[PDB]
């Protein structure tokens, strides 16, 4: 491999300059082959890669992991690998009451409850997203039938305090955390994940582009978490893979 | 007056919605007669408002004077009477080679160097503009035959060290800020300004909207003073319209 | 212009070494014509700028514009033309139940609620005044027959969230002001202003002499000439 | 599932109330297979956990992917089904010279460079080890002939520039960064890794008991990413296996 | 003197690599006595020293005063006369209710709750005690038939407000150490000190060893102000151990 | 004792509002013996309190060890049995060329360098003294011929690294302080001590009043001098008391 942890070389994305980057590794297949002649790349540690064709450009089909480490080691990776284009696509809590279970979520920026951020710039910077590549998220999603909601997403290094759950082993969540969840919805914030805070400051730092879309599986207003009586349209998925195209074209 | 420091009643702006805040109160006039009807509202310390009408709509316009603290006055007075929608219009100095004086930056987010952003929300909340104000801003820019810089700014509390310029009094900048234009400029950043931090911050968290448009009128790759020496303020109007349409 | 914001020239100050800084461009010409022969310098922006003379010396009157950011901008400029000496005067309102509307306050430091003070000295260093100059606005006010008010000072970016005020179109004040007034009342905090913080910070830490006196108009808990006539005759005992 | 990504139940850990917890699903099989029926839990996302038993008790084996987010979600979901005792296994770079590749570092505490422990305590509070496991892990590494090397880890959030790497796409490392293994090394730091902060300072918040033995593939004094120049001793994931033993005896 | 406030030169002290260090310099003597040939060394300022001999070897005994600063200038110049082992003994107020008065807490790593400690490292840096010198005072500990609690220490440049005590002449304690006890109680922190986070971080980023063993004289689920030793005793044993 | 550290009653004291709060326990009965009828109130750890009569009102002089910490400790105290005014004398190295050693400053404020001072207020607040009690030691000083430099000092948890210090062991300073003496220098910072912090924070916002000399006895650029300082604090404490 030409990378550390990926197991991939350049050779392996075909020049590919734009992946899409799902959290999941079992998702990622599933992503490819709404492309062409999708292919089975590698599968290292979280890290499972694919190729596939969208009207005849490659691109790249990479899982990050959970949280924005594991982020943080695939989206350089693939840049040194030729990648200069990362589409998220995920899955969220809203916490917004109008934000219904699934409904898709483009984030324009994110509160940085992260560390990993911290690594390529100072609190002060915002983590953005790529304006282009989000107008395409937006476009992909109205093309759909959908509109989305746009706006500020809480991106948390945790699942359970961080984003105030406390349904857990203590039910304590430590006092910065706790009353944050209102602190978040009084400002507007539209939802918890956990990844796009670094990614975006990662890739507007280091001179990449990215956008982030999620499909809403949980209100926070009414479940910590989803469970079979959540109910149960169109895809983040789908829409990325437009979005891609979008940008290729 | 309905409002402490602007002078203003909600019956004065004749239902606007939107304002269009550049810093400077003398530009206000001049905003003001781009647009129709533009009549005099009031002129308090450094908020000089005007009334103007953007193809048929009411449009206040609004100088924040220089910097975050002023500027936080002007936007919430203004939305408590009916304002939610906030365009700013400014100068700035690119700190990329890349940008030339006379060109437009849109600033789609800013790094917050600034304080008042903070009385808002604590620091990792992203100053960010809204999506759909930013939107227009670009097409206005593009209507107009500019194709803007699109990307973050730093928005700084300070002109002088802040901003990292030396051609001072005693030619020291604090620690924190020695050598932060080279920490911005390799992270892409495209300029330096005083308010957006602020004013985006305050919109983002306060269920408002707002967009920046500026022009360039120095490059610190260049010179710290800018030389004496429009198409700024014609996008911001320009983009007005489209949000109103 | 010689400086970039204010539009001043060294010449036009005739060696004036003290400003005396109000936050509103719209009372530098009253205050200038407290003292001999005002004289109309420049308008831009926020900043109105004036000349008169305190007992034969000159003495510059600019205004500020509200809140640290547009001040560093003033101070800056004023001391590229050799000012030295910066002497604030405004109004304020307390946040003490002893402290009537009608009183004076003397600034003695600040509370840094401010971003610019930052950009001068990292948030350890005191917002500090100048003591000889802290001194002249304490004998100005006992002249006057006023016992000021010497004391702390809430220096905020806001008027609204960051002086914990509530009626306000969201009526929300972000978690870190949330019961920060009366965390100010309990540590003697006198008044909330916008200026002082950066004022001071920057005079000291660049070796510049800054003082602040402000009548009080109003108490959050329950005189403008006033507190005018004192700064120049504060200015007068600096310059005598 | 009784807890929402492990994709487990109470009764599949049969009582289990130590795990290991390596960062490689795929090394999960291989150090459930050091111990007795070893047997396959679940496999959902980073997350793949088997049960195995370590001279007659029962031990839960779970991966926890890159980074103290991943780690924080299969943290608390084992303690939610009774797990109160946290033995990490992995592998790390040295960033002192006499440190060297094949050694084991038993980390006594970490540097908090990380954003997911402050989701349970403020930067104050140490990220230490429990000290009886901390104990456990040092006598298992001597049983086995190996002097371990115990101190201070660097617990890093990114692989790339909060381990002040600069081979990466950018080379560029920000300013609170640079010249950061500098200050660590000075202060005699032993190595990098990026999980033990979130780890120990959740454990030691919430009740639970955590340690950490880990082996060098790398010494950063040399090389910033090993090669096959790299020297390659008694492995860390024997030792971990031995510390468990002892704990449950 | 060879240093700068403790007023030794390093002829004084015999060769000693291993010094004790209370807080209270009154404390001194006492713990001296417990070895051999104990001698007077000097006193300045809260710097009361002795010197004495374990099965032979020569001990420092040292006062640190009250708090990091005062912490930090001692261990800095008895390390410029050789010392790299520094075992503190001292006093503590317990905050969990299963920790009795009388009962010795020995210090894993602290909280820091002190400025001093910023001084030598930043926030992010653990205030952990060195292994072996820990190893050393629970074994010292239950050898003399006493389980120590072996935790987290809460280490406060106060003993007011930074312990959220309200027995006060305010009778307030600022924002941030307001609910504060609560925070650390929450966390399984074990007591409140006031040295060991300084004293901690600076060995830890200085190649020297530390650890601390201390007497519960209060509980605070109980109480503020402890009602008016087997520590020392343990401290003994435990520099003994670690010089064999 | 009514107080825990100190050993004190407020009977102890005959009124006292006043405390002189030199660092050494050694130095107090001295300092103590400037004034009438020094009389001996307790001894405990580093805690050396006396009370004596300046121009016939009654004075305490009580020690408070090096630093924050253990000053925080007799100033809580001591203001616990009516102390309300605090007056910290001693001495100090110059960072600044112009201050000579022999010469005398007076801390208006200090730089907060110190962890104690956090634990009465975020660092915000300004660690000032009390006016009257900095104007009371200028005039001592000036009514003994002294002009004194009136400024910022920078108050240290710290002798060493925080003091930019590096003729210790390792020879080393923590990024943050690093280049931190020339920072403080360019921004006018005329010494470092190590309590000052402290004292004014907790003075300032607890209510009550502070100030603090200090005779210069080295300078970082570059017996009598303590006795002149200990003269002034006791001169000021007159003027304040009268
Ligand atoms: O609530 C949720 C759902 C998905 N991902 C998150 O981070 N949080
Ligand atoms: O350089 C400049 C010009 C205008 N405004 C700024 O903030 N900076
Ligand atoms: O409660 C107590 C007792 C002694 N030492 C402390 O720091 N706290």
């Known amino acids: 491999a030409d990378?550390?942890?990926?197991?991939?070389?350049?050779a392996m994305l075909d020049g590919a300059t734009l992946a899409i980057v799902p959290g999941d590794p079992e998702r990622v297949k599933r992503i490819a082959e709404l492309?062409?002649?999708?292919?089975?790349?590698?599968?290292?540690?979280?890290?499972?890669?694919?190729?596939a064709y969208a009207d005849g450009k490659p691109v790249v089909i990479c899982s990050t992991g959970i949280g924005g480490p594991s982020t943080s080691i695939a989206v350089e990776e693939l840049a040194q690998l030729g990648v200069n284009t990362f589409l998220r696509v995920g899955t969220t809590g809203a916490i917004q009451p109008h934000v219904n279970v699934g409904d898709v979520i483009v984030t324009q920026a994110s509160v940085r409850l992260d560390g990993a951020s911290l690594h390529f710039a100072p609190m002060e910077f915002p983590a953005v997203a790529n304006?282009?590549?989000?107008?395409?998220?937006?476009?992909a999603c109205r093309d759909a039938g959908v509109e989305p909601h746009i706006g500020v997403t809480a991106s948390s290094d945790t699942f359970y305090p961080g984003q105030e759950?406390?349904?857990?082993?203590?039910?304590?969540?430590?006092?910065?955390?706790?009353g944050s969840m209102k602190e978040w919805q009084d400002m507007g914030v539209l939802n918890y994940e956990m990844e796009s805070a670094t990614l975006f400051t990662m890739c507007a730092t280091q001179g990449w582009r990215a956008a982030?879309?999620?499909?809403?599986?949980?209100?926070?207003?009414?479940?910590?978490?989803?469970?079979?009586?959540?109910?149960?349209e169109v895809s983040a998925v789908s829409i990325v893979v437009a979005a891609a195209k979008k940008l290729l074209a």
């Open 165 to 178: 759950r406390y349904d857990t082993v203590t039910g304590r969540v430590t006092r910065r955390f706790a």
């Open 131 to 139: 304006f282009e590549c989000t107008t395409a998220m937006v476009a």
């Open 3 to 10: 990378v550390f942890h990926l197991g991939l070389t350049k």
């Open 35 to 51: 492309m062409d002649n999708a292919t089975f790349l590698a599968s290292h540690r979280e890290y499972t890669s694919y190729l």
């Open 212 to 232: 982030s879309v999620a499909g809403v599986i949980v209100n926070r207003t009414q479940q910590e978490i989803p469970d079979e009586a959540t109910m149960k």
